Design a protein around this nucleic acid. Structure first.
Lengths: 89, 90
DNA sequence: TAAAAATACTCCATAGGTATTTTAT
DNA sequence: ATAAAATACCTATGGAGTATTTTTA
């Protein structure tokens, strides 16, 4: 598990398309699709419904998404706050 | 950045040695150093002091450090709960 | 001075790309 | 029929290794 997997996962959910996700992320659709499989096979959990356009989360997906964005958000504050402090000497 | 960078950094700080943390993480010391460099380099900050046997954080480090340990703990939480749901136990 | 951290490469595992097929409209 | 996702294969960036040179206690 890396932030990469989350950020990728989040892009899929928000955008409801590996394609549109892959565009926004500036990578191709397959490698994206593989990183999602990887995430899932690592958790042994199915995060996205297979067999439907648009692309929708499973109950577990939705739970995970919720903690994903909150957790990515927290990384971003962690970095900001840290930079402000590097101006104290 | 990535969780690898955090976990590594945390390891380092906890051991107060790159060398001790290296094999703690089952990797070599030199790559470790580089990862920690890139981290500081990406943030454009100095998270560790520029030289001390008992290697210790800067202020920026300490803050990051504690926050890091909270985030990694978050990732664990996230995984446990999802797992917990997936397993069929609410 | 003798430990521990930093270079200077080498190697390879794997994230990312290309071509094609399969599935779901 | 036709676009998007899945599958297979290939490439190449950077994570990890070995040998070696700085460091600072």
């Amino acid at each position: 598990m890396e932030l990469r997997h989350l950020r990728y996962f989040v892009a899929v959910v928000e955008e409801q398309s590996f394609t549109k996700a892959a565009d926004k992320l500036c990578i191709a659709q397959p490698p994206l699709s593989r990183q999602i499989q990887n995430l899932e096979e690592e958790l042994g959990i199915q995060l996205l419904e297979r067999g439907s356009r648009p692309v929708k989360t499973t109950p577990e997906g939705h739970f995970f998404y919720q903690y994903a964005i909150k957790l990515l958000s927290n990384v971003d504050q962690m970095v900001s706050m840290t930079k402000r402090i590097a101006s104290g000497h």
